[PDB]
Design an enzyme around this catalytic site. Sequence first.
Site, PDB file in Angstrom:
ATOM      1  CD1 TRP A 291      -3.389  -0.570   1.059  1.00 51.15           C
ATOM      2  CD2 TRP A 291      -2.065  -2.342   1.419  1.00 51.15           C
ATOM      3  NE1 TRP A 291      -4.194  -1.676   1.185  1.00 51.15           N
ATOM      4  CE2 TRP A 291      -3.413  -2.777   1.402  1.00 51.15           C
ATOM      5  CE3 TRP A 291      -1.054  -3.282   1.630  1.00 51.15           C
ATOM      6  CZ2 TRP A 291      -3.778  -4.113   1.583  1.00 51.15           C
ATOM      7  CZ3 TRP A 291      -1.418  -4.617   1.815  1.00 51.15           C
ATOM      8  CH2 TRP A 291      -2.778  -5.015   1.788  1.00 51.15           C
TER       9      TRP A 291
ATOM     10  CB  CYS B 296      -8.654  -5.273  -0.108  1.00 49.95           C
ATOM     11  SG  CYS B 296      -9.848  -4.197  -0.796  1.00 49.95           S
TER      12      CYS B 296
ATOM     13  CG  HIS C 143     -11.805  -4.876   3.158  1.00 51.80           C
ATOM     14  ND1 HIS C 143     -10.684  -5.058   2.377  1.00 51.80           N
ATOM     15  CD2 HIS C 143     -11.831  -5.915   4.019  1.00 51.80           C
ATOM     16  CE1 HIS C 143     -10.063  -6.161   2.749  1.00 51.80           C
ATOM     17  NE2 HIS C 143     -10.741  -6.700   3.739  1.00 51.80           N
TER      18      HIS C 143
ATOM     19  CG  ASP D 203     -10.869 -10.334   4.199  1.00 57.87           C
ATOM     20  OD1 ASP D 203      -9.950 -10.064   3.372  1.00 57.87           O
ATOM     21  OD2 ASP D 203     -11.504  -9.469   4.857  1.00 57.87           O
TER      22      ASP D 203
ATOM     23  CG  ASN E  30     -22.594  -6.039  13.058  1.00 58.27           C
ATOM     24  OD1 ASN E  30     -23.682  -5.467  13.168  1.00 58.27           O
ATOM     25  ND2 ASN E  30     -22.441  -7.124  12.325  1.00 58.27           N
TER      26      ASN E  30
ATOM     27  CG  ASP F 142     -21.468   0.689  18.290  1.00 59.62           C
ATOM     28  OD1 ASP F 142     -22.118   0.641  17.235  1.00 59.62           O
ATOM     29  OD2 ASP F 142     -21.966   0.424  19.401  1.00 59.62           O
TER      30      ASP F 142
ATOM     31  CD  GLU G 188     -29.629   1.434  14.972  1.00 60.13           C
ATOM     32  OE1 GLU G 188     -30.354   2.413  14.644  1.00 60.13           O
ATOM     33  OE2 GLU G 188     -29.512   1.035  16.156  1.00 60.13           O
TER      34      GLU G 188
ATOM     35  CD  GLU H  91     -29.501  -3.306  15.889  1.00 59.30           C
ATOM     36  OE1 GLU H  91     -30.406  -2.992  16.718  1.00 59.30           O
ATOM     37  OE2 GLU H  91     -28.866  -2.467  15.199  1.00 59.30           O
TER      38      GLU H  91
ATOM     39  CE1 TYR I 174      -6.529   0.343  -0.777  1.00 60.38           C
ATOM     40  CE2 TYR I 174      -8.746  -0.416  -0.210  1.00 60.38           C
ATOM     41  CZ  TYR I 174      -7.425  -0.693  -0.473  1.00 60.38           C
ATOM     42  OH  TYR I 174      -6.998  -2.004  -0.508  1.00 60.38           O
TER      43      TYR I 174
END
Lengths: 705, 715
Positions: A257, A292, A351, A374, A414, A416, A463, A468, A538
């Site tokens: 990168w 990626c 991503h 991944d 997920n 926060d 949400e 959830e 990015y």
Amino acid sequence: GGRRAVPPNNSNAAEDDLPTVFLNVTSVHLFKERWDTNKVDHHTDKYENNKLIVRRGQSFYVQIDFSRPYDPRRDLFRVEYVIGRYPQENKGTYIPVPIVSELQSGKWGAKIVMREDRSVRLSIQSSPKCIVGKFRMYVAVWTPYGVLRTSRNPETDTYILFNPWCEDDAVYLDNEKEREEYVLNDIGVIFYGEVNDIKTRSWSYGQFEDGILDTCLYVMDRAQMDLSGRGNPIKVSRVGSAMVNAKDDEGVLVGSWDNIYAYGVPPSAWTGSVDILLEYRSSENPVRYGQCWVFAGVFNTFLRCLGIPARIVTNYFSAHDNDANLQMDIFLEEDGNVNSKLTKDSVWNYHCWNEAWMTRPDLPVGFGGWQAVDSTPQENSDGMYRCGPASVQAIKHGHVCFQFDAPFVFAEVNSDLIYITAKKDGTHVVENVDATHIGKLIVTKQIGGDGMMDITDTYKFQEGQEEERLALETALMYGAKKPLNTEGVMKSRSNVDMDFEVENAVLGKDFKLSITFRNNSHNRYTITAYLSANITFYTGVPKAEFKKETFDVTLEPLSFKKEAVLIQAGEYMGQLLEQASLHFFVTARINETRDVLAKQKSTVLTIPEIIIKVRGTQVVGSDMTVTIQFTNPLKETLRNVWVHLDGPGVTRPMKKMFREIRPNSTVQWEEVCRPWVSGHRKLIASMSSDSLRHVYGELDVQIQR
Amino acid sequence: GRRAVPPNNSNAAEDDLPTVELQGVVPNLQEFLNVTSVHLFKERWDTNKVDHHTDKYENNKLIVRRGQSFYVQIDFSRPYDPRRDLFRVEYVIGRYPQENKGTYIPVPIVSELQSGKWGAKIVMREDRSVRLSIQSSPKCIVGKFRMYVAVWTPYGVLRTSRNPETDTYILFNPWCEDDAVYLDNEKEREEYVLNDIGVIFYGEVNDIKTRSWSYGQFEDGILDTCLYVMDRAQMDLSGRGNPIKVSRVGSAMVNAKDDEGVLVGSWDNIYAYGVPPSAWTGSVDILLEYRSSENPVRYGQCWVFAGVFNTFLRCLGIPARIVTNYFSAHDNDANLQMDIFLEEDGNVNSKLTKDSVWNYHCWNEAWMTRPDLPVGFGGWQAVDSTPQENSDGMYRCGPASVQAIKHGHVCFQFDAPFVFAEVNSDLIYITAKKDGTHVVENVDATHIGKLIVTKQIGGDGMMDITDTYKFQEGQEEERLALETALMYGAKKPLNTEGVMKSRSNVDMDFEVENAVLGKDFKLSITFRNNSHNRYTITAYLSANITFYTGVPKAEFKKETFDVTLEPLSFKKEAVLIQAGEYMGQLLEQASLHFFVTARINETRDVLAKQKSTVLTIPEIIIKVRGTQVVGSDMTVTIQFTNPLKETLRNVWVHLDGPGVTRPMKKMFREIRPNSTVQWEEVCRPWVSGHRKLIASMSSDSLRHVYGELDVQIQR
């Protein structure tokens, strides 16, 4: 050798000579012609290969021609299939196919479909759990002394692949449209940019080109994979994905990168997988630089080629390197300004990771389906490795106790956002939590055309929902962590909603950025917003802060005020990075209630396209001229400019270079191609200069035979 | 552009923090408090090390255990005024500390120390000095930290300079209610954490042999090496607080996959450029060797990998123990069936039987909770450093929860199916009929997970733990466990039909007496005719020279005989094995294998049986003369007589005993036939209480010969 009587049989390329010692075989007939029954029936007609290529768990025909007519009264023979250097039917590497009366499903078997003067016609069937590879073929005759066998015959080598069309294979896909897109399609679309400004580009998977299927087996032999395990989707994706990121001279692609790329091809340059996989093969060493989406193109080429249903997924605002935490920290200064000293983790604009389709007999029922894998490393339970296969179905529900690094992918989608004020005395206090920024949109190419599809709810519920709440509490049980309780919560805003928006510029221009504050209280406030715009990669990593600004605001009761900022191209043009991404922050403080409001957004500067031009007869075997046209938009001379041309079916990947291009001139690329495939095809181009890069072009060429 | 901050991977790397970091425009001095000296009561007699159970490490720095308070005293340039003064202690590790990942921890002096949080209570202040009680979070990271005292000025921070003397080691703490690695009682803790000596159980089920191994987790330099090992594995420091990841990444480091790992596994019988795996007396020997060379230590097999990984686990504080499984199906690929092929004549088909059951195989068990799996799966976790094909390739397996294995829940992570298969397979006898057809004759569901044994909590006796890994033979709970496995991955290729034999209840079974090396002995087969009927048989006896893993080298004796059983008859046949048939062809652990197959002619049922023998090799003699007093001299005499009728060349004797002697080795050019060589040595014991001396012998010919002696070294 104390350890084991037989060394490992982990190379398909390795082979031994099976000894050749009434009724001899003169010739064997496989209907390997690409127009023939076999390949067409097996959906193996697309490969540019001259051997028979069949799909496991399904019937195919062969015809032995003996020295005299076989009669079921004094004659016994069987077809043998062997792989590797130490075959054992005990290990599945040695399959004796017996001439059965009828073909029992799920079991190897031969059936004399017809016989006439020295030629028995067979309908061989393979088990749906067969090892995927290139098997050697033999006809063996059991005489009353010994067994008479055939000599080594290269031209009868059979490739046996995963068969999604077969109802008993783990890799089974119940829909032709899906099997079409997910296996047969060799051209794909990767999405990038940012949530509010999605960008598209094309990738050539090239799974049917000359050489690819053979390098996929080579990769596995390089992985030194046990031959007995190559017929297992799970282990296959689990071992393959680990070969994508060149772990120091080992893997396929060296990941980089640094906006320099001191010794290879810039990640953005790549047109597709073919380019790379064949260089890997030739050099036998890692191909330089990928990121990626590159790791994901090559990997998707590996799954599709072998027959495993795969599609590349793009996540927007992706929390990578999460280490299972569900909390991303944004550090704030006492006054409300963003703190760059320590606010060191970024959410990637976007991503890319792959998704393979298979069953999960290693977990409970229901977790089968699409498995997120991944190949871009991250720290999981074993170290810095690729993650998955994780059951997308487990993720959506919080069953992160089910294997193949499921917790580290749950977090990606997920986390926060926590805005924590770091007080000048070494104290910390949390002010706001954004539960709606990470994994804002997950998208993938639509089955029809190059459009996009919102597979967002396949990973999470909307949400606010109870389900959830539930998925979260479940993950929390199986190791996902939230180190900081919201403790109290966030800023009541005193009924004050603020939010901003950035206009969508075009490389080299200027653009506004309005900011809207809505007071709902019957109250007058006094805000002090700040604006911090940086030049980022990015991945979210900031290089420099090109603009800073502060506002003093007076909010009237039930008032709605909006203010405009003007970002002059002169402020950004000098520091821009590889994909022209800009990130904004807007932290504000309401002096009365010392409430902190905070917002983030990203922008990507729209870069022009390359113009691909075709003039001619669009007929297979016929020359057709293509033109690669690029006008240097930069008001600067571009140095060492390269253009790449690819198009599976129409062209082998090519790359042209130019020492330089005068500010605002146009270069043309002339090339004549002999298309070997007919039907809707596609030409693809990329541009890479010491300066500008991530300039892509593509034409929807149409071909007839 | 990949990450804003590079990976904080090392513990050896370190950043330099500024002694004064001020910031603020113009608006006594800078005479504020100032630290004159620091006192960590780190002496071994002191409170800290003792209350922390860290007084045994031959280490001069302060070693402590997470989640528990320790005392320190800071000496200032002047009295601590609870008004004008403001300060706090700091622990930082690696080149790139961040509060976020626990790599930079600012210990706020707190009034009352809350549980689970870092905090320092000012317990007492004398003139100019302050005494603190600092408490670490139970979830802290394990490794060597750096201490600094920092003083807050309104314009910044004044802080101490790099003082290597105050570096503090923070380890796992089995004594802490909240530490994920907690153990309920002392008997266990002293045994699985503090005990630096163990016994490895090997041999064969009917001849369980023993040898001592020095874990030596407390010798000089081991602690550091353990840390060096996670550094060589580029282990993110934020992970070293996870007992799962430490043992996960740690076990993968044992087996050297070229240039990397700690040991090069080897099972040939030469061991050219190294030390035979049978010579190793303990891990100390090997770890320091790893460390000094920074390259793999040559030659280890399954007991060695476990002896090293065990020293590592215990050294950092994770309860652990070596476990030997008798008759092991390693390299099982999650198949619950091992196959033996028979030629049409009922004889064993040596050309097709390529798999093997190890006479024994030892792994490690590690104790910790499992917050990643449903409740109930915590506790002992199986970990095996000896690689075998699993989900990822040829890697080690574990931590696999022993509780999940036992109930068949193999869906729960860390290579379960494979350790499960290691202990739950069935031997399947298949007649490979000359036409190309196979027929499943016999099935022995009771050979493989036979006896899983471990050392005992008290002394050096064994402890049968087979019931932790598996239920009782042919009982419903075992029928369910097994059925759950098959549901989460484990497989059974061949089906045993509804039945596939009855053997007409003509039972067969044999017993082999065990000779000493070089002696003749007998093997004795018997036959029961449980039917009001008469039969005719043909038995086959195959005696092979094998490696401890089951792999054969040669057949030194085949025998066929006709037994005619009258109705309700019980004939017995005996065979005499003369030493001459095996002597000049034996491998390292003097293991002999026996196959006994028969054909009941009439009711053509096949009966097969296999067992293994290890020839008894005589001990090495250790006698001490001097004083059982630390500091004081004591003499150690190693005596070894050549039992063989041939001369032994390049005989390597080894001596070791943690807390008594540094691992040593003396080479002897030769030992004539029935000669007796002696090795005298003087040790100045440095540890008190029960101790043990350990010897080992390895030569060109004879090898795998041990000995020991329990000394009582008091003050």
